[PDB]
Design a binder for this molecule. Sequence first.
Ligand code: B12
Length: 409
Amino acid sequence: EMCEIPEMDSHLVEKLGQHLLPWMDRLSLEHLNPSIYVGLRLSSLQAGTKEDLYLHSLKLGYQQCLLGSAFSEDDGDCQGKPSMGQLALYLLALRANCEFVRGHKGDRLVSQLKWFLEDEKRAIGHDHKGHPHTSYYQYGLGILALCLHQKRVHDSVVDKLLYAVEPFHQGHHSVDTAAMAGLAFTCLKRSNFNPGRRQRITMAIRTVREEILKAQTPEGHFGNVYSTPLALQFLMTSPMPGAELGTACLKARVALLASLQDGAFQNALMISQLLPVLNHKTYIDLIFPDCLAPRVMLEPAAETIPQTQEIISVTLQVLSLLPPYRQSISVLAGSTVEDVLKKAHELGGFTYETQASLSGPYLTSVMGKAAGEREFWQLLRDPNTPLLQGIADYRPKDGETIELRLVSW
Ligand code: B12
């Protein structure tokens, strides 16, 4: 149809699936990723028996931790617990296996996620002035999740998502939050969930595609390379032709195909967001999913690029702190930013804290300064160009400088 990408080189898709393959074995609570599972099921690729065991661990961990305690066993956080944002994605994972939340534990989880959105609605406080504690992205994903499990939220919850769509938004992220918000609305619209806002919701969806389609860079991308998959995902639901989508969507293909054969898609989460798209599938396909639709097996990557020894110098610097820190760390070539961070800690006076996430290690504290409220520890490559990847996916080159900067958004 109108916003459609033709199929790609069968082995390029297979290449991406092979990146996911080593994750199907890290069933650790701090490595289980519902987005990966959803990724596979909606792709043209299929792991194998590993899948079912992965889903089982998801069901185990996510329920064992989010439900199962009365007066608490006198501990701080004895699992860490999945975030409510993470719970939302787990719900899509269930859908990926053609399942609805079953039993009391189902009722409990649904109830929990409805509460999260309710707190995030208080956090905003009416239709002006105030941010969610998480982000409008998880807010949109919360609404979408429950909508896929045939659970409705009150109009006052949808209201806040409706409002964020109009203005707001600066810097690449906008395009993802728009796409997510956009998808949520599609869902609601396709089942008439908030009738009192039916006409209102349709307008918003129309608002979203303008915002997104407007943000198409001359390369062909939507916002950036990593905002493109989720953008396309949303745009593959909009049924209004003319011409607009046709060429713009087909342009994105070129921009994507280029980046793809460049190795831009290293991150497991990002592969799992593109794979459905690559298979003409969206998260909206999780309303009526096809569990019998066949997918080709994935052989183990088996061979692993051995690379080559070449010791390189990378300058790590932290301004935005007490005495500014800067030290030329020496690592093996192909090392990740996290390796540079790691060597610095053991080398001298440097520390850092991370958190796990569906996206990988998230940098939270540097040199003993934990990021506050609407601030975060930005990653940058000198001069002043923010990184498109995290500490665990960016592999700096010789003589490069990395800045860890505490900005506020
Ligand atoms: C929310 C968000 C943020 C927020 C998070 C704070 C908040 N609001 O609570 C802010 C604005 C701070 C942010 C910053 C960054 N982000 Co961000 N972010 C997102 C967004 C919109 C949604 C993620 C989300 O909420 N997921 C839902 C829940 C279920 O997932 P989760 O794993 O539990 O969510 C946590 C992590 O995703 C983490 N997080 C957010 N961004 C990133 C990026 C990386 C690399 C990692 C490891 C973690 C991480 O924030 C969430 C917890 O609050 C996505 C869009 C997308 N398409 O995924 C981009 C996205 C994940 N971010 C991205 C990037 C590049 C970054 C930064 C590295 C930017 C930078 N140059 O410094 C930083 C991370 C800083 C760090 N210390 O590592 C990319 C990752 C691309 C890739 N190939 O890995 C994405 C896809 C956006 C994009 N299109 O470029 N981000």
